[PDB]
Amino acid sequence: GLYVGGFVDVVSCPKLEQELYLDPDQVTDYLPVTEPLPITIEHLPETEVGWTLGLFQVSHGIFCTGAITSPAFLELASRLADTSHVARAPVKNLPKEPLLEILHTWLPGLSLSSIHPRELSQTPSGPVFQHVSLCALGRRRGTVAVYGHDAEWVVSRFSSVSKSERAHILQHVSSCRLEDLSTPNFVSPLE
Ligand SMILES: O=C(O)c1ccc(NC(=O)c2cccc(CC3CCCCC3)n2)c(Nc2ccccc2)c1
Numbered sequence: 001g002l003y004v005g006g007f008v009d010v011v012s013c014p015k016l017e018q019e020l021y022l023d024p025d026q027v028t029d030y031l032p033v034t035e036p037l038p039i040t041i042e043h044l045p046e047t048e049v050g051w052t053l054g055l056f057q058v059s060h061g062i063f064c065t066g067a068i069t070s071p072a073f074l075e076l077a078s079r080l081a082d083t084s085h086v087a088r089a090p091v092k093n094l095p096k097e098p099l100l101e102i103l104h105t106w107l108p109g110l111s112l113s114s115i116h117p118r119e120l121s122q123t124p125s126g127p128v129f130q131h132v133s134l135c136a137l138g139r140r141r142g143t144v145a146v147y148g149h150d151a152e153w154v155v156s157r158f159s160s161v162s163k164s165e166r167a168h169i170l171q172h173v174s175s176c177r178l179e180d181l182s183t184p185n186f187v188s189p190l191e
Helices: 071-083 098-106 117-121 151-156 163-174
Strands: 002-007 009-011 038-041 050-058 061-068 109-114 129-135 146-148
Touching: 002 098, 002 109, 002 151, 038 061, 050 129, 050 163, 061 109, 061 151, 061 163, 071 098, 098 146, 146 151, 151 163
Parallel strands: 009 109, 038 129
Antiparallel strands: 002 061, 002 146, 038 050, 050 061, 109 129
16 A cells, blocks of 8 residues: 655646636635545546545645555556566666656646535535546646655655644544555556
8 A cells, every 4th residue: 555645736627628727725715624535547537546535735735645555556556667668767767666756757746626616615515626636747836746655754755844734644644544445446457
């Protein structure tokens, strides 16, 4: 099981337009979110690879911590990290932890899917957020996603998160066991 952390772009995938980047301040009222949301690849519902453990408002923006739990995805990505020249081409030579470096490089973006700002201004009936996506394109704000084996290590990699914010974040993360989370639906494309 891997952990992922970083600051999200807040998007509401629209039907008419190509993309809509929300200002984080439009959703802070609905944070924090400590119930598990799916983590997918590029907003594709069939690519669940894990679950969020917390969405938090911090000084520097909206910070997300999640767990990558899909066995099919972890096995595939680990094999690629040790054997694929394509996966290793855009990363530094001979990394000590190739899996982490390859996710860090190939999926640097975290995007939080929100309902349209129309309902955010009023009183929403249902959930405001649907999922978080690991993304290869469309990154707007600075900083990139961090992947690691230890949650504390992931969050501490962000100097823009204070000691107080890290302690609040890690309280919820440690309060959840990944065993009683359902298996994500990701299927290896090689099948
Ligand atoms: O079915 C097909 O024809 C097909 C073709 C291309 C695909 N993926 C891509 O083109 C692509 C681009 C950027 C980032 C990623 C994610 C990342 C996962 C594990 C380490 C290496 C890559 N995939 C995918 N999807 C996919 C591939 C590998 C892992 C996960 C999803 C499918």
